[PDB]
Coordinates of C-alpha atoms and ligand atoms in Angstrom, one line a residue:
Chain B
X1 CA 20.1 16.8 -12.6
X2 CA 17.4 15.1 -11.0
X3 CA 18.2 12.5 -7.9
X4 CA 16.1 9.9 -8.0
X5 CA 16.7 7.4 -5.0
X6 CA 16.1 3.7 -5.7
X7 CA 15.1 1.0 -3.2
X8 CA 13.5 -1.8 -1.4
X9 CA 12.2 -2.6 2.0
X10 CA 9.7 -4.3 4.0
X11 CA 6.3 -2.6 5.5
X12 CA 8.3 -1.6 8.2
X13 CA 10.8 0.8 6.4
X14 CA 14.1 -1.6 6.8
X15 CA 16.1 -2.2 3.5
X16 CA 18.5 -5.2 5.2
X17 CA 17.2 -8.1 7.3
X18 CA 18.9 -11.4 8.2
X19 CA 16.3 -13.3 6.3
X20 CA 17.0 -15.3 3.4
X21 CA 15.9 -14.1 0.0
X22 CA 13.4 -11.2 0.8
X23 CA 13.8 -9.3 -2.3
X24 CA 11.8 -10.5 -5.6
X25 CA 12.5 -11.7 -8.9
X26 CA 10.5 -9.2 -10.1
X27 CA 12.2 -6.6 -8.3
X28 CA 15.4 -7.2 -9.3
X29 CA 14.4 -7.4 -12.8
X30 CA 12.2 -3.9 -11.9
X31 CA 15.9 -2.5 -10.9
X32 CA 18.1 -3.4 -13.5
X33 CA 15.5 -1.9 -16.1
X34 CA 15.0 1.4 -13.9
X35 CA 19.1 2.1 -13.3
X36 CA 20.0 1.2 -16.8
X37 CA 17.4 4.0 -18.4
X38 CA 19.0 6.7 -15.5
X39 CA 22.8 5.2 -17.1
X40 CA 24.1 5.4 -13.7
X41 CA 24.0 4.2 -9.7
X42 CA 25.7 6.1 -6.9
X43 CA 26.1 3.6 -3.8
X44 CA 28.2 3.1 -0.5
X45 CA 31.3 1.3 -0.5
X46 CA 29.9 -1.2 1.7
X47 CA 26.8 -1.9 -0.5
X48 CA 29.3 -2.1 -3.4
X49 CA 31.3 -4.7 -1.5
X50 CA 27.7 -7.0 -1.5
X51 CA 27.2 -6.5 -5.1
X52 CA 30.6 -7.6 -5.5
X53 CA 31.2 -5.7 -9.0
X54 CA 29.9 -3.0 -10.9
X55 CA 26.8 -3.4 -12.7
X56 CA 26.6 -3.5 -16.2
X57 CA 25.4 -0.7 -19.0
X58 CA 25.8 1.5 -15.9
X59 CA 28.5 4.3 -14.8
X60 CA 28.7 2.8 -11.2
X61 CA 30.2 5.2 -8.7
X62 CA 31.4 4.1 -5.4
X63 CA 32.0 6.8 -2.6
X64 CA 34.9 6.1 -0.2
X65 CA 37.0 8.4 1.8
X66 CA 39.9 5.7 0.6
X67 CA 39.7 6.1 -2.9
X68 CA 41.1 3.0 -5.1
X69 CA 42.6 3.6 -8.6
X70 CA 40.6 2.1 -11.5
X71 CA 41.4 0.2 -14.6
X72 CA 37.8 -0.3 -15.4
X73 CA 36.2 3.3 -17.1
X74 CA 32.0 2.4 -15.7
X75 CA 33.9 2.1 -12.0
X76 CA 34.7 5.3 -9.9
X77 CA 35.6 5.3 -6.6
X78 CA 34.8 8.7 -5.7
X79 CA 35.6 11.1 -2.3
X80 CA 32.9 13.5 -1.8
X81 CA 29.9 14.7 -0.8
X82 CA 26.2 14.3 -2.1
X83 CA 26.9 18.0 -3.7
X84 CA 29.8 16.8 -5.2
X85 CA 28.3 13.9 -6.5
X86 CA 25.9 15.4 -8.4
X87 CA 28.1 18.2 -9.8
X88 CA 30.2 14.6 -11.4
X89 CA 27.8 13.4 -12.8
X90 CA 26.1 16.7 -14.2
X91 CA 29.2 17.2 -15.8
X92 CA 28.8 13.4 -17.8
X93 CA 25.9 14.5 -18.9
X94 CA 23.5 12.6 -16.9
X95 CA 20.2 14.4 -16.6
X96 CA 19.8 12.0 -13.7
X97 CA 21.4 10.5 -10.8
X98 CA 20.2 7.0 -9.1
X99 CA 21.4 6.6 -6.0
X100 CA 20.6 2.8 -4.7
X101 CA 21.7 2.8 -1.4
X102 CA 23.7 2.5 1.9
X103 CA 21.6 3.7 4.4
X104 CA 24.4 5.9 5.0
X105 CA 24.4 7.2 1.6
X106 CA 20.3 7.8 1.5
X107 CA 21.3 9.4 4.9
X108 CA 23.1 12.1 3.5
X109 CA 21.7 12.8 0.3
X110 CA 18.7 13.4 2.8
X111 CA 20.1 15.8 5.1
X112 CA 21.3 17.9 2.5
X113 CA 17.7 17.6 0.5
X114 CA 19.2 16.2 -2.4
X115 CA 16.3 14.0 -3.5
X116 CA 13.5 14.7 -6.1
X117 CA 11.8 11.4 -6.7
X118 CA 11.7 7.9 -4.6
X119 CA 11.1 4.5 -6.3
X120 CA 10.3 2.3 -3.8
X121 CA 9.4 -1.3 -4.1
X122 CA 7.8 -2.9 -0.5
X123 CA 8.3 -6.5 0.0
X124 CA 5.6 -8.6 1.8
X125 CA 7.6 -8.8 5.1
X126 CA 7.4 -7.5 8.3
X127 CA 11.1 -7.8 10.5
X128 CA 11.8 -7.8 13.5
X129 CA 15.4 -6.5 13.1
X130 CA 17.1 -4.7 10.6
X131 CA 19.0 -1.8 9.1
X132 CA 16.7 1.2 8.8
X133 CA 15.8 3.4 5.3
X134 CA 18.1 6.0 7.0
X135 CA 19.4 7.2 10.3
X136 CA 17.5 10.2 12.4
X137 CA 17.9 13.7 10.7
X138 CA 15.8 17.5 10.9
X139 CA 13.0 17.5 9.0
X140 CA 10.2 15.8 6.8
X141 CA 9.4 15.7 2.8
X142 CA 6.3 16.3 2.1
X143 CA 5.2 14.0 -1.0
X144 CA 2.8 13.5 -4.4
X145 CA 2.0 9.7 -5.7
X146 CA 2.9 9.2 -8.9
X147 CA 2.8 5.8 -9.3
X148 CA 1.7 2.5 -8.1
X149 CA 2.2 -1.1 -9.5
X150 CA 1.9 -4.7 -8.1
X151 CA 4.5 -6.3 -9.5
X152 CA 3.3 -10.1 -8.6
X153 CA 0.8 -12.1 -6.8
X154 CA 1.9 -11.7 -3.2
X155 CA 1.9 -8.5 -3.5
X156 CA 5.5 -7.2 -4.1
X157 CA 4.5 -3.2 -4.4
X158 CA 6.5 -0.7 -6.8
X159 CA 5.7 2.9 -6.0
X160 CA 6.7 5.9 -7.1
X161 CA 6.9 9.4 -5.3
X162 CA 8.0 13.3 -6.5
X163 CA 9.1 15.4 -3.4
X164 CA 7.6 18.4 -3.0
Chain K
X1 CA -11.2 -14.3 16.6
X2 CA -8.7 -12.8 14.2
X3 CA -6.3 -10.2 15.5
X4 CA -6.1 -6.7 12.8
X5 CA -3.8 -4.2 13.3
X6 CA -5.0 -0.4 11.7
X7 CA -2.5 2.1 11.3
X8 CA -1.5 4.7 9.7
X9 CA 2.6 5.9 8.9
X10 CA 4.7 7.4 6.4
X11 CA 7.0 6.1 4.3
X12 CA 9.4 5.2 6.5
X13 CA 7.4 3.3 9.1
X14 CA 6.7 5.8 11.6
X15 CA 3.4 6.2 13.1
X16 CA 4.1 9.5 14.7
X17 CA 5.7 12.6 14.6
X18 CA 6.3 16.2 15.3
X19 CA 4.4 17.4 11.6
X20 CA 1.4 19.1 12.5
X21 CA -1.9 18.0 10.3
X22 CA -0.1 15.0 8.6
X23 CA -3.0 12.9 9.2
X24 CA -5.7 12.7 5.7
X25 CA -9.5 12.7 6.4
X26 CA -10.0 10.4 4.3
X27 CA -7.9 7.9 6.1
X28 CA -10.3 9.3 9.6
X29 CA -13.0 8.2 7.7
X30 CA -12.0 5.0 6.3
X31 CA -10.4 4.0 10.3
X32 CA -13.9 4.9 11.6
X33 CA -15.7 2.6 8.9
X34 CA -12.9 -0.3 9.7
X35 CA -13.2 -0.1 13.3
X36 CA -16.8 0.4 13.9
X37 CA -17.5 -2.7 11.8
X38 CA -14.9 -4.7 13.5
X39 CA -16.8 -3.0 16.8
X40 CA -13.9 -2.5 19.1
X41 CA -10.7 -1.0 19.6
X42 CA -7.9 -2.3 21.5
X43 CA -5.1 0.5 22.1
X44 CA -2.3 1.6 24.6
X45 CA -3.2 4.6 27.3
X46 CA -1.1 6.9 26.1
X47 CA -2.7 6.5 22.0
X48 CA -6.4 6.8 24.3
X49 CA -5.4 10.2 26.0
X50 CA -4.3 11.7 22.6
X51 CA -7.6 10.7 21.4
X52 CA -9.2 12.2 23.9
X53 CA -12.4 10.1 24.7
X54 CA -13.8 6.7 23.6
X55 CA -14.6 6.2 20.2
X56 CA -18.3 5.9 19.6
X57 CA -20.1 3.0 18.7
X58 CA -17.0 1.1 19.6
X59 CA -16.1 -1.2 22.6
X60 CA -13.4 0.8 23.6
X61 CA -10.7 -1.4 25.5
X62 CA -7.8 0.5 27.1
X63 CA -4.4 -1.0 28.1
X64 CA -3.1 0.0 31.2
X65 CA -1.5 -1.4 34.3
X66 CA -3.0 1.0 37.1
X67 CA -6.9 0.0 36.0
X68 CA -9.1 2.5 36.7
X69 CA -13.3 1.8 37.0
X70 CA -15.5 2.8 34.2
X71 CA -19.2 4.5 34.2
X72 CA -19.1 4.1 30.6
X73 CA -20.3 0.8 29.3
X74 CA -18.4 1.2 25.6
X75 CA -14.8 1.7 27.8
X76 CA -12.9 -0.5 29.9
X77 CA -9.4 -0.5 31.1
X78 CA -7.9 -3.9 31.0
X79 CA -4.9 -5.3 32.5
X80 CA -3.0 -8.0 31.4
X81 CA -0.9 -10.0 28.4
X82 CA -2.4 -9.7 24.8
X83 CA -3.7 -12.9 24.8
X84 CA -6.0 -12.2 27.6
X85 CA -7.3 -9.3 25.3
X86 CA -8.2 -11.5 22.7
X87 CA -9.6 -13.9 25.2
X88 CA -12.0 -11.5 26.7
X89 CA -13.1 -10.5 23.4
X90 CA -13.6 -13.1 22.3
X91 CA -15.8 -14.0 25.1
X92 CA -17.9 -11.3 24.4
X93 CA -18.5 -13.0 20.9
X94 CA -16.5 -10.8 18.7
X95 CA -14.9 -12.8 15.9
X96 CA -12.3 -9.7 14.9
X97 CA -9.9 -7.6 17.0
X98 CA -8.9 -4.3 16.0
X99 CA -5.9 -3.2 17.6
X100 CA -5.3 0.6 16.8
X101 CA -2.0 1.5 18.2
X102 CA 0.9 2.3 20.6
X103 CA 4.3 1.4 19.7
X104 CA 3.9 0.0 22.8
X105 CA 1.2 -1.9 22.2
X106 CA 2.2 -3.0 18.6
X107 CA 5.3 -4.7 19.9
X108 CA 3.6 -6.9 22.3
X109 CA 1.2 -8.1 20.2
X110 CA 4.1 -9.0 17.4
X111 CA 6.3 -10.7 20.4
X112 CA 3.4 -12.8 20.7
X113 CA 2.9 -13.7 17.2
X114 CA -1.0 -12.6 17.3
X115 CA -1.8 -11.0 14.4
X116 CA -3.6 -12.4 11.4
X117 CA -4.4 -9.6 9.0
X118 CA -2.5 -5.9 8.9
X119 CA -5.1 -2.9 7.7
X120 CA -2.1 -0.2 6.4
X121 CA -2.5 3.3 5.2
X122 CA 1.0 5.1 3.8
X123 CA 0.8 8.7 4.3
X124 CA 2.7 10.7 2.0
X125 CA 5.5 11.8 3.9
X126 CA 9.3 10.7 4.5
X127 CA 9.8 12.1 8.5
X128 CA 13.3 12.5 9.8
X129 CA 12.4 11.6 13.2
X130 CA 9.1 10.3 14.7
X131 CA 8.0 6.6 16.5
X132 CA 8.4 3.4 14.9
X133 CA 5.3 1.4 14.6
X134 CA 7.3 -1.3 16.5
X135 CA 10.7 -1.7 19.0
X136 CA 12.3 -4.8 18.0
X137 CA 11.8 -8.4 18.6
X138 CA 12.8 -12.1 17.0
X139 CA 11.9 -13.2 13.7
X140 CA 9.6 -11.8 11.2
X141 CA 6.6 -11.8 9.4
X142 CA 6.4 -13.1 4.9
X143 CA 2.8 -11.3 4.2
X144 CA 0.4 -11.4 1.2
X145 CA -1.0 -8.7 -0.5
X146 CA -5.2 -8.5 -0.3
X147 CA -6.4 -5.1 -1.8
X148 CA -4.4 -1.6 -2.5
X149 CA -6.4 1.2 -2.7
X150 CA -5.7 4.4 -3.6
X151 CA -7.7 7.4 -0.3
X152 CA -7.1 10.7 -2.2
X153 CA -5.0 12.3 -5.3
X154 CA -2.5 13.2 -3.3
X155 CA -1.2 9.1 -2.9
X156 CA -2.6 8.5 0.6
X157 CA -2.7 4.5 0.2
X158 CA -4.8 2.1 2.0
X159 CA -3.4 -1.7 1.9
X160 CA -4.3 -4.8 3.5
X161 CA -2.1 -7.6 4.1
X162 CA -2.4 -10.7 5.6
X163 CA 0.2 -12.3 7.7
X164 CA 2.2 -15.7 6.8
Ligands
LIG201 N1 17.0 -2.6 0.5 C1 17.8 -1.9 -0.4 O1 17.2 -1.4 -1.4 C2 19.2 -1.7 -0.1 C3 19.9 -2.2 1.0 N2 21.2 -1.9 1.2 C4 21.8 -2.5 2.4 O2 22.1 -1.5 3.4 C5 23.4 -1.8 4.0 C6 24.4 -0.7 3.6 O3 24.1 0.5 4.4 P1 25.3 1.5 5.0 O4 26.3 0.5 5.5 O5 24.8 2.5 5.9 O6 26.0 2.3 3.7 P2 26.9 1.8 2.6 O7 27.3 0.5 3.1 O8 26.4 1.6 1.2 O9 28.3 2.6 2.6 C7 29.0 3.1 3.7 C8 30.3 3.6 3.3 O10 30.3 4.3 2.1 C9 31.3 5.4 2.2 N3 30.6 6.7 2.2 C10 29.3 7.1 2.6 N4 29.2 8.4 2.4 C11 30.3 8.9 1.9 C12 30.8 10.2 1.5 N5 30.0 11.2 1.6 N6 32.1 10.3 1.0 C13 32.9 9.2 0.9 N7 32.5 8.0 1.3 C14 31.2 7.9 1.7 C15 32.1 5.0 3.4 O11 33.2 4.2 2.8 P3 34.7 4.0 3.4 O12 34.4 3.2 4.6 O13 35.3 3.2 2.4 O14 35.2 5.3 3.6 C16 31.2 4.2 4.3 O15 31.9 3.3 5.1 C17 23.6 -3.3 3.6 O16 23.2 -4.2 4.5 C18 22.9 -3.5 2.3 O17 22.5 -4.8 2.0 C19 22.0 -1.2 0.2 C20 21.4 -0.7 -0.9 C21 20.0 -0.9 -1.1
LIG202 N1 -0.1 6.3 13.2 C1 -0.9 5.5 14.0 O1 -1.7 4.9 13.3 C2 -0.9 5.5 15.4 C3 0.1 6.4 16.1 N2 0.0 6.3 17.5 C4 1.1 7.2 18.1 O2 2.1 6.4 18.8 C5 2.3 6.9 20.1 C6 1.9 5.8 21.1 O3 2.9 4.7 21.3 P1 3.2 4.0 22.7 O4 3.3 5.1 23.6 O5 4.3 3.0 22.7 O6 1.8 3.1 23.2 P2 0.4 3.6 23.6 O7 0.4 5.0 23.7 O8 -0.7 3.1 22.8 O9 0.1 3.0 25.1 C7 1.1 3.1 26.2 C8 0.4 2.6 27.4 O10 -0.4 1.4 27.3 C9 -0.2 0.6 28.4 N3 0.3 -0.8 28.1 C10 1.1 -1.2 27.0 N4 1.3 -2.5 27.1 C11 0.6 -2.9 28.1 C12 0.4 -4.2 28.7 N5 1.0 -5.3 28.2 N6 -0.4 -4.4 29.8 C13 -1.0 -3.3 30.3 N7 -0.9 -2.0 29.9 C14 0.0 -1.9 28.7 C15 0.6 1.4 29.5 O11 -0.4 1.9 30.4 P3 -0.1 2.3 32.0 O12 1.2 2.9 31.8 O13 -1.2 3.3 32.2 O14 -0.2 1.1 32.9 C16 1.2 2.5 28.7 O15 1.2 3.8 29.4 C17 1.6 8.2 20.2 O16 2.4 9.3 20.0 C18 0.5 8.2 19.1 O17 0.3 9.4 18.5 C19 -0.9 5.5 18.2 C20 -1.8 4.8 17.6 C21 -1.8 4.8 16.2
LIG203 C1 22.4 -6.2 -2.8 N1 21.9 -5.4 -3.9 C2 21.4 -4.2 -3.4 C3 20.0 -4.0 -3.8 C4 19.0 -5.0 -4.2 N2 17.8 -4.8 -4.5 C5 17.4 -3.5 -4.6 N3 16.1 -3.3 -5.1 C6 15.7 -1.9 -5.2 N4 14.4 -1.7 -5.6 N5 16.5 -0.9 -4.9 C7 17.9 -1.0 -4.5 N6 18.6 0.0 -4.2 C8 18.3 -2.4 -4.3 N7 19.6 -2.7 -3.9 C9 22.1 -5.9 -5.2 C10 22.7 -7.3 -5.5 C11 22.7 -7.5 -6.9 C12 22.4 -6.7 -8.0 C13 22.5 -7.2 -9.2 O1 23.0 -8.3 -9.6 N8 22.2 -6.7 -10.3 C14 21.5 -6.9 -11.5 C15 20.0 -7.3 -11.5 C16 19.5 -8.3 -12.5 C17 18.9 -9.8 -12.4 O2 18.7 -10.5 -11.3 O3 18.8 -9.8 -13.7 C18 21.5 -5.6 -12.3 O4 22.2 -5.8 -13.4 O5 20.9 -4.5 -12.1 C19 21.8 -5.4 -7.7 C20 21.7 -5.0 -6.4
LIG204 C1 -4.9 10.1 17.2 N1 -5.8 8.9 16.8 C2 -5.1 7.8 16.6 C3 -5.2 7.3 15.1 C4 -5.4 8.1 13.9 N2 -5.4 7.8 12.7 C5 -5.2 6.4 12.5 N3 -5.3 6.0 11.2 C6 -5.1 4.6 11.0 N4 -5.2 4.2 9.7 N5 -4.9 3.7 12.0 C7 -4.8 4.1 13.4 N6 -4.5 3.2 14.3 C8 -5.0 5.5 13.6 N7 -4.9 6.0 14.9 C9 -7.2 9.3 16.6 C10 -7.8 10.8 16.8 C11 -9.1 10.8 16.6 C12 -10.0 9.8 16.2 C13 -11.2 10.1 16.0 O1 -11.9 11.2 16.1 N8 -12.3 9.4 15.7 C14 -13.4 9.3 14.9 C15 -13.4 9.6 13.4 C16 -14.3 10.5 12.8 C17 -14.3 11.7 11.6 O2 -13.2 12.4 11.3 O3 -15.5 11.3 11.4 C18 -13.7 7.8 14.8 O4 -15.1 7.7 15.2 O5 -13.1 6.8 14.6 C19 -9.5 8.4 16.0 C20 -8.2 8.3 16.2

């Protein structure tokens, strides 16, 4: 399958600030529509916890070293690595995998090159302070545009990339 | 006068780092048409010894502590806050600032809340390590979307925002 990482963040490459209602309308919208098409989202415990429940129409794994038994059949708390992820997942059926975040999580699907195609939105923000895209690792991914949209008038940017 | 930054970083905000040749020519080209109309460039030292020699046709105006005299009448190494910057420019009758770079140099400049417009090309790249266009500092900036513009097939993007 194909990992196709889904996020937001401000020009400065941070996906979690302390200010108030950063991300858009139209960008939440923009998710739900993307994540329901791939079927399934792969996220960190801790972005989980935020969410607060599993997202609808979609398999929703959450990785955690503390596994919690589940009475609800789209919720899996899983212990393993990216590889392992993906193997799960291949073996639903899932041609692809979204994985929506943690920076820890985009951390390590990174290190281990696990990533064929960003969707990245940028919010019209620039802050000061904030959790980074990912933490330092070896190496670069070179990149191909393949798409660009503006999804409203102050200038909330969807953009899509293929790793090369 | 208005305060512009130009720069140019990957994905992940980083305006530098160790991958050779990551820099398009068409985003040389479009930075020499920016700054030359603007008609000066305010930048750190360090970002003025990697490029080697004042920019022509360009009031070149270095940052630096230890000032150093000038033959040339196009360079000048300046000492003091960024508001003094501004305020010599300005004196000089320039109505735009262009301020091309230096983490260094970025952060002070966003500590003091001058900056009115922000000229940004996304290279398209995701780099592990490299410098962050800034270090961090209080509060934040909500931006507006002027023009996106598209350098080369490959997804270099040139965007212009403008701050608050
Ligand atoms: N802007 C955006 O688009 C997004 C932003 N975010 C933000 O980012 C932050 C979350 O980032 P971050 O805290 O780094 O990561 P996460 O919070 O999403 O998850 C961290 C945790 O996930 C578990 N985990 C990670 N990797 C593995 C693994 N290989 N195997 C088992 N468990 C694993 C661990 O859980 P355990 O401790 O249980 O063992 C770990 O504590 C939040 O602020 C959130 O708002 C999140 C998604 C998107
Ligand atoms: N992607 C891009 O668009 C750009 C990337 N870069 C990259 O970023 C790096 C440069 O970042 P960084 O080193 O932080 O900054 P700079 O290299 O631009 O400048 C550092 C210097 O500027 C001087 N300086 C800074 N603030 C002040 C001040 N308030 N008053 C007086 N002098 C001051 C100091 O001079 P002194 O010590 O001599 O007193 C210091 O040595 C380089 O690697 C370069 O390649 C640079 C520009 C653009
Ligand atoms: C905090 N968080 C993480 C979050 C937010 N925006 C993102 N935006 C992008 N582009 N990518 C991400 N990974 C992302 N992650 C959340 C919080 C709520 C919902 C949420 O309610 N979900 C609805 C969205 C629908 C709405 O507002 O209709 C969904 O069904 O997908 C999703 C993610
Ligand atoms: C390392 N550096 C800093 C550099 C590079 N690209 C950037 N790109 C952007 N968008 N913004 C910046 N601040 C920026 N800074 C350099 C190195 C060379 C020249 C340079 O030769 N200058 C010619 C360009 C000429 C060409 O290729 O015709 C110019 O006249 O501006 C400029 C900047």
């Amino acid at each position: 399958a194909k990992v196709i990482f889904v996020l937001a963040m401000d020009v400065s490459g941070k996906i979690a600030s302390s200010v108030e209602s950063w991300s858009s309308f139209e960008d939440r919208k923009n998710f739900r529509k993307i994540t329901t098409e791939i079927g399934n989202v792969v996220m960190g415990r801790i972005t989980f916890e935020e969410i607060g429940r599993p997202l609808p129409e979609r398999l929703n794994v959450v990785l955690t070293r503390r596994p919690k038994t589940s009475n609800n059949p789209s919720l899996v708390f899983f212990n393993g690595s990216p590889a392992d992820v993906v193997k799960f997942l291949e073996g639903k059926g899932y041609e692809r995998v979204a994985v929506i975040g943690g920076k820890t999580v985009f951390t390590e699907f990174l290190r281990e090159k696990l990533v064929d195609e960003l969707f990245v939105t940028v919010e019209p923000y620039v802050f000061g302070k904030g959790i980074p895209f990912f933490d330092e690792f070896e190496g670069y991914f070179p990149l191909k545009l393949l798409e660009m949209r503006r999804l409203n008038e102050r200038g909330t940017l969807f953009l899509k990339y293929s790793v090369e």
